[PDB]
Protein backbone atom coordinates (compact mmCIF):
# COMPACT_ATOMS: atom_id res chain seq x y z
CA UNK A 1 0.00 0.00 0.00
CA UNK A 2 2.45 2.59 -1.29
CA UNK A 3 0.84 5.68 -2.78
CA UNK A 4 3.89 7.90 -3.32
CA UNK A 5 7.05 7.19 -5.29
CA UNK A 6 9.22 10.22 -6.03
CA UNK A 7 12.22 10.22 -8.36
CA UNK A 8 15.14 12.38 -7.28
CA UNK A 9 16.31 15.11 -9.67
CA UNK A 10 19.72 13.42 -9.72
CA UNK A 11 18.18 9.97 -10.03
CA UNK A 12 20.61 8.49 -7.50
CA UNK A 13 17.78 8.25 -4.97
CA UNK A 14 14.16 7.16 -5.00
CA UNK A 15 11.62 7.89 -2.27
CA UNK A 16 8.64 5.78 -1.32
CA UNK A 17 5.97 6.38 1.28
CA UNK A 18 3.16 4.07 2.26
CA UNK A 19 1.36 3.22 5.49
CA UNK A 20 4.58 2.18 7.24
CA UNK A 21 4.79 5.80 8.49
CA UNK A 22 8.41 5.65 7.30
CA UNK A 23 9.85 7.48 4.31
CA UNK A 24 12.19 5.08 2.54
CA UNK A 25 15.01 6.63 0.51
CA UNK A 26 16.76 4.06 -1.66
CA UNK A 27 20.22 4.74 -3.04
CA UNK A 28 20.34 3.42 -6.60
CA UNK A 29 24.15 3.62 -6.86
CA UNK A 30 26.55 1.44 -4.86
CA UNK A 31 30.09 0.26 -5.48
CA UNK A 32 28.68 -3.09 -4.36
CA UNK A 33 26.32 -2.71 -7.32
CA UNK A 34 23.23 -3.63 -5.29
CA UNK A 35 20.35 -1.26 -4.56
CA UNK A 36 20.62 -0.67 -0.81
CA UNK A 37 18.34 1.55 1.24
CA UNK A 38 19.93 4.97 1.62
CA UNK A 39 17.98 6.27 4.61
CA UNK A 40 14.93 5.35 6.65
CA UNK A 41 13.03 8.46 7.78
CA UNK A 42 11.14 7.36 10.89
CA UNK A 43 9.21 9.75 13.10
CA UNK A 44 6.31 11.01 10.97
CA UNK A 45 3.16 11.72 12.95
CA UNK A 46 1.11 9.62 10.54
CA UNK A 47 1.28 7.78 7.23
CA UNK A 48 3.16 9.27 4.31
CA UNK A 49 0.89 10.46 1.51
CA UNK A 50 3.05 12.32 -1.02
CA UNK A 51 6.76 13.13 -0.91
CA UNK A 52 8.98 15.12 -3.25
CA UNK A 53 12.70 15.52 -3.75
CA UNK A 54 13.32 19.24 -3.55
CA UNK A 55 16.85 18.05 -2.76
CA UNK A 56 18.96 14.93 -3.01
CA UNK A 57 19.75 15.20 0.71
CA UNK A 58 16.45 16.81 1.72
CA UNK A 59 12.86 15.85 0.96
CA UNK A 60 9.42 17.26 1.63
CA UNK A 61 7.14 14.57 3.08
CA UNK A 62 3.41 15.32 3.05
CA UNK A 63 2.35 12.76 5.65
CA UNK A 64 -0.79 11.92 7.56
CA UNK A 65 -2.01 13.67 10.70
CA UNK A 66 -1.84 17.17 9.21
CA UNK A 67 1.90 17.30 8.59
CA UNK A 68 4.03 17.98 5.52
CA UNK A 69 7.31 18.52 7.34
CA UNK A 70 10.66 18.72 5.54
CA UNK A 71 13.40 16.22 6.37
CA UNK A 72 17.15 16.34 5.93
CA UNK A 73 17.92 12.97 4.35
CA UNK A 74 21.47 12.83 5.72
CA UNK A 75 20.67 13.16 9.42
CA UNK A 76 17.20 11.64 9.25
CA UNK A 77 16.06 14.61 11.34
CA UNK A 78 13.27 17.08 10.74
CA UNK A 79 14.40 20.15 8.82
CA UNK A 80 11.31 22.39 8.54
CA UNK A 81 8.29 21.16 10.46
CA UNK A 82 5.05 22.27 8.82
CA UNK A 83 1.78 22.50 10.74
CA UNK A 84 -1.51 24.31 10.26
CA UNK A 85 -3.87 22.00 8.42
CA UNK A 86 -6.99 20.46 9.93
CA UNK A 87 -7.19 17.44 7.66
CA UNK A 88 -4.13 15.30 7.03
CA UNK A 89 -1.75 16.61 4.39
CA UNK A 90 -2.28 14.10 1.59
CA UNK A 91 -1.36 15.83 -1.69
CA UNK A 92 1.58 18.08 -2.52
CA UNK A 93 3.18 19.88 -5.48
CA UNK A 94 6.51 21.66 -5.96
CA UNK A 95 6.66 24.75 -8.14
CA UNK A 96 9.21 24.94 -10.97
CA UNK A 97 10.41 27.83 -8.81
CA UNK A 98 11.34 25.06 -6.32
CA UNK A 99 10.38 27.61 -3.66
CA UNK A 100 6.60 27.14 -3.29
CA UNK A 101 5.17 23.77 -2.28
CA UNK A 102 1.37 23.76 -2.17
CA UNK A 103 -0.01 20.86 -0.16
CA UNK A 104 -3.51 19.53 -0.82
CA UNK A 105 -4.99 18.13 2.37
CA UNK A 106 -8.33 16.87 3.65
CA UNK A 107 -9.05 20.33 5.06
CA UNK A 108 -10.18 21.09 1.47
CA UNK A 109 -7.75 24.03 1.36
CA UNK A 110 -4.50 24.16 -0.61
CA UNK A 111 -1.90 25.61 1.76
CA UNK A 112 0.99 27.08 -0.23
CA UNK A 113 3.88 27.38 2.22
CA UNK A 114 7.48 28.52 2.01
CA UNK A 115 9.90 25.66 1.48
CA UNK A 116 12.57 26.37 4.11
CA UNK A 117 10.92 29.09 6.22
CA UNK A 118 8.33 27.12 8.19
CA UNK A 119 5.54 29.50 7.17
CA UNK A 120 2.45 29.10 5.01
CA UNK A 121 2.43 31.88 2.42
CA UNK A 122 -1.26 31.53 1.61
CA UNK A 123 -4.25 29.19 1.79
CA UNK A 124 -6.10 28.92 -1.51
CA UNK A 125 -9.67 27.88 -0.78
CA UNK A 126 -12.56 27.06 -3.08
CA UNK A 127 -12.67 23.28 -3.08
CA UNK A 128 -15.34 21.75 -0.85
CA UNK A 129 -13.81 18.30 -1.33
CA UNK A 130 -10.38 16.95 -0.47
CA UNK A 131 -7.71 17.91 -2.99
CA UNK A 132 -6.57 14.75 -4.77
CA UNK A 133 -3.62 16.02 -6.82
CA UNK A 134 -1.96 19.38 -7.46
CA UNK A 135 0.09 20.18 -10.56
CA UNK A 136 1.91 23.49 -10.73
CA UNK A 137 2.00 25.66 -13.82
CA UNK A 138 5.22 25.28 -15.85
CA UNK A 139 6.41 28.47 -14.13
CA UNK A 140 5.32 28.06 -10.50
CA UNK A 141 3.07 31.12 -10.74
CA UNK A 142 -0.11 29.00 -10.61
CA UNK A 143 -1.38 25.47 -10.12
CA UNK A 144 -4.52 23.56 -11.00
CA UNK A 145 -6.50 21.83 -8.27
Amino acid sequence: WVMTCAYAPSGNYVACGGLDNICSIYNLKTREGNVRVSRELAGHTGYLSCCRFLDDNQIVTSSGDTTCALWDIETGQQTTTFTGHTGDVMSLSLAPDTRLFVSGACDASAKLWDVREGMCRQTFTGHESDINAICFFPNGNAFAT
Binding site: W1, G33, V35, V37, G46, G64, D88
Partner: protein
Protein backbone atom coordinates in the same frame (compact mmCIF):
# COMPACT_ATOMS: atom_id res chain seq x y z
CA UNK B 1 42.83 -13.27 54.08
CA UNK B 2 43.64 -9.56 54.05
CA UNK B 3 47.29 -9.71 55.16
CA UNK B 4 48.61 -8.02 52.02
CA UNK B 5 47.30 -6.57 48.77
CA UNK B 6 46.41 -10.07 47.55
CA UNK B 7 43.30 -11.61 49.14
CA UNK B 8 41.85 -15.12 49.17
CA UNK B 9 38.92 -16.00 46.90
CA UNK B 10 37.01 -19.28 47.33
CA UNK B 11 35.97 -20.93 44.06
CA UNK B 12 35.78 -24.69 43.63
CA UNK B 13 37.03 -24.95 47.21
CA UNK B 14 40.36 -23.54 46.06
CA UNK B 15 41.78 -20.31 47.47
CA UNK B 16 43.03 -17.83 44.86
CA UNK B 17 45.35 -14.88 45.57
CA UNK B 18 43.64 -12.03 43.73
CA UNK B 19 44.50 -8.36 43.96
CA UNK B 20 41.91 -5.90 45.22
CA UNK B 21 41.29 -4.27 41.83
CA UNK B 22 40.44 -7.60 40.15
CA UNK B 23 37.58 -7.70 42.66
CA UNK B 24 36.91 -3.94 42.65
CA UNK B 25 35.63 -1.90 39.73
CA UNK B 26 32.33 -0.54 41.11
CA UNK B 27 30.39 -0.48 44.41
CA UNK B 28 27.52 -2.53 42.96
CA UNK B 29 29.45 -5.80 42.53
CA UNK B 30 29.74 -8.52 45.18
CA UNK B 31 33.53 -8.96 44.89
CA UNK B 32 33.97 -5.38 46.15
CA UNK B 33 32.84 -5.99 49.74
CA UNK B 34 35.46 -8.71 50.27
CA UNK B 35 38.19 -6.07 49.89
CA UNK B 36 36.53 -3.95 52.61
CA UNK B 37 37.26 -4.87 56.23
CA UNK B 38 34.51 -4.86 58.87
CA UNK B 39 33.76 -7.00 61.96
CA UNK B 40 30.51 -8.30 60.41
CA UNK B 41 32.37 -10.46 57.86
CA UNK B 42 30.91 -13.92 58.48
CA UNK B 43 32.64 -15.49 55.45
CA UNK B 44 35.56 -16.46 57.70
CA UNK B 45 36.46 -20.14 58.04
CA UNK B 46 38.70 -22.22 60.30
CA UNK B 47 41.05 -23.42 57.55
CA UNK B 48 42.93 -20.29 56.47
CA UNK B 49 40.26 -17.62 56.78
CA UNK B 50 39.42 -17.45 53.07
CA UNK B 51 36.22 -15.71 51.98
CA UNK B 52 33.59 -18.00 50.48
CA UNK B 53 31.56 -17.24 47.34
CA UNK B 54 28.89 -19.21 45.47
CA UNK B 55 30.86 -18.91 42.24
CA UNK B 56 31.45 -22.18 40.39
CA UNK B 57 29.82 -20.85 37.22
CA UNK B 58 29.53 -21.32 33.46
CA UNK B 59 28.57 -17.83 32.17
CA UNK B 60 30.32 -15.38 34.54
CA UNK B 61 33.44 -15.13 32.37
CA UNK B 62 32.69 -13.19 29.19
CA UNK B 63 30.30 -10.93 31.10
CA UNK B 64 32.93 -10.19 33.75
CA UNK B 65 35.06 -9.21 30.76
CA UNK B 66 32.06 -7.08 29.76
CA UNK B 67 32.16 -5.39 33.17
CA UNK B 68 35.89 -4.85 32.69
CA UNK B 69 35.51 -3.28 29.22
CA UNK B 70 31.84 -2.33 28.76
CA UNK B 71 30.96 -3.94 25.42
CA UNK B 72 28.09 -6.44 25.30
CA UNK B 73 29.31 -9.96 24.51
CA UNK B 74 27.73 -11.96 21.68
CA UNK B 75 29.30 -15.25 20.61
CA UNK B 76 28.72 -17.36 17.52
CA UNK B 77 27.03 -19.85 19.89
CA UNK B 78 25.77 -17.27 22.41
CA UNK B 79 23.87 -14.43 20.73
CA UNK B 80 22.01 -11.38 22.08
CA UNK B 81 20.19 -13.89 24.30
CA UNK B 82 23.45 -14.31 26.21
CA UNK B 83 23.74 -10.56 26.66
CA UNK B 84 20.05 -10.35 27.56
CA UNK B 85 20.42 -13.04 30.24
CA UNK B 86 23.86 -12.71 31.86
CA UNK B 87 25.21 -9.27 31.00
CA UNK B 88 22.08 -7.77 32.53
CA UNK B 89 22.66 -9.63 35.80
CA UNK B 90 26.30 -8.69 36.23
CA UNK B 91 25.01 -5.09 36.47
CA UNK B 92 26.80 -3.16 33.73
CA UNK B 93 25.07 0.21 33.63
CA UNK B 94 25.82 0.87 29.95
CA UNK B 95 23.94 -2.27 28.86
CA UNK B 96 20.54 -0.63 29.39
CA UNK B 97 20.80 1.15 26.05
CA UNK B 98 22.72 -1.70 24.41
CA UNK B 99 20.54 -4.63 25.60
CA UNK B 100 17.55 -2.77 24.13
CA UNK B 101 18.91 -3.59 20.68
CA UNK B 102 19.79 -7.03 22.08
CA UNK B 103 16.13 -7.00 23.17
CA UNK B 104 14.88 -5.87 19.74
CA UNK B 105 17.32 -8.10 17.87
CA UNK B 106 16.16 -10.93 20.12
CA UNK B 107 12.59 -9.92 19.34
CA UNK B 108 13.59 -9.58 15.69
CA UNK B 109 14.54 -13.24 15.89
CA UNK B 110 11.61 -14.41 18.03
CA UNK B 111 9.22 -12.40 15.85
CA UNK B 112 10.07 -14.82 13.04
CA UNK B 113 8.96 -17.84 15.09
CA UNK B 114 5.47 -17.18 13.64
CA UNK B 115 7.30 -16.75 10.36
CA UNK B 116 6.73 -13.22 9.04
CA UNK B 117 8.16 -12.84 5.53
CA UNK B 118 7.25 -10.07 3.12
CA UNK B 119 6.53 -11.82 -0.17
CA UNK B 120 6.75 -10.03 -3.51
CA UNK B 121 5.83 -11.03 -7.06
CA UNK B 122 7.93 -9.37 -9.77
CA UNK B 123 6.90 -10.09 -13.34
CA UNK B 124 9.87 -10.27 -15.69
CA UNK B 125 10.46 -11.11 -19.30
CA UNK B 126 13.13 -13.78 -19.59
CA UNK B 127 15.83 -11.38 -20.76
CA UNK B 128 14.88 -9.28 -17.71
CA UNK B 129 15.74 -11.69 -14.89
CA UNK B 130 19.48 -11.62 -14.44
CA UNK B 131 19.62 -7.84 -13.97
CA UNK B 132 17.14 -7.50 -11.13
CA UNK B 133 18.25 -10.88 -9.80
CA UNK B 134 21.85 -9.69 -9.67
CA UNK B 135 20.67 -6.36 -8.21
CA UNK B 136 18.51 -7.95 -5.53
CA UNK B 137 18.08 -5.64 -2.56
CA UNK B 138 19.90 -6.19 0.72
CA UNK B 139 18.05 -8.49 3.08
CA UNK B 140 15.84 -9.49 0.13
CA UNK B 141 16.33 -13.14 -0.79
CA UNK B 142 15.22 -14.91 -3.94
CA UNK B 143 12.77 -17.70 -3.23
CA UNK B 144 10.93 -18.84 -6.35
CA UNK B 145 10.71 -18.19 -10.07
CA UNK B 146 7.80 -19.61 -12.06
CA UNK B 147 7.38 -19.64 -15.82
CA UNK B 148 4.14 -18.57 -17.49
CA UNK B 149 2.88 -18.61 -21.06
CA UNK B 150 1.32 -15.71 -22.91
CA UNK B 151 -1.35 -15.23 -25.56
CA UNK B 152 1.19 -14.23 -28.24
CA UNK B 153 4.19 -16.37 -29.24
CA UNK B 154 3.78 -18.85 -26.37
CA UNK B 155 5.14 -16.28 -23.92
CA UNK B 156 8.86 -16.13 -24.64
CA UNK B 157 10.21 -12.70 -25.62
CA UNK B 158 7.13 -11.26 -23.90
CA UNK B 159 6.79 -9.43 -20.60
CA UNK B 160 4.44 -12.15 -19.28
CA UNK B 161 6.93 -15.00 -19.25
CA UNK B 162 8.39 -15.27 -15.73
CA UNK B 163 7.24 -14.39 -12.22
CA UNK B 164 10.03 -14.06 -9.71
CA UNK B 165 8.95 -14.35 -6.08
CA UNK B 166 11.15 -12.98 -3.32
CA UNK B 167 10.91 -12.65 0.44
CA UNK B 168 12.36 -10.50 3.19
CA UNK B 169 12.38 -11.15 6.91
CA UNK B 170 11.19 -8.68 9.50
CA UNK B 171 13.40 -7.06 12.09
CA UNK B 172 10.14 -5.99 13.73
CA UNK B 173 9.22 -6.93 17.24
CA UNK B 174 6.35 -9.43 17.55
CA UNK B 175 2.93 -7.90 16.93
CA UNK B 176 -0.70 -8.97 17.01
CA UNK B 177 -2.05 -6.19 14.79
CA UNK B 178 -1.14 -2.76 13.45
CA UNK B 179 -3.43 0.19 14.16
CA UNK B 180 -3.37 3.96 13.72
CA UNK B 181 -6.32 6.23 14.59
CA UNK B 182 -6.31 7.82 11.12
CA UNK B 183 -9.71 7.21 9.52
CA UNK B 184 -8.68 8.44 6.07
CA UNK B 185 -6.05 5.72 5.78
CA UNK B 186 -8.87 3.24 6.33
CA UNK B 187 -10.93 5.06 3.69
CA UNK B 188 -8.05 4.75 1.24
CA UNK B 189 -7.54 1.06 2.02
CA UNK B 190 -11.24 0.33 1.50
CA UNK B 191 -11.27 2.37 -1.72
CA UNK B 192 -8.29 0.41 -3.01
CA UNK B 193 -9.87 -2.88 -1.96
CA UNK B 194 -12.06 -2.87 -5.07
Amino acid sequence: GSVSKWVRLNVGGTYFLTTRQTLCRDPKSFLYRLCQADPDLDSDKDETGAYLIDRDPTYFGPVLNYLRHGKLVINKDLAEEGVLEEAEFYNITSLIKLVKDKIRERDSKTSQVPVKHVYRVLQCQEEELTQMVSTMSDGWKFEQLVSIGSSYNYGNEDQAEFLCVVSKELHNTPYGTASEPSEKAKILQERGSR
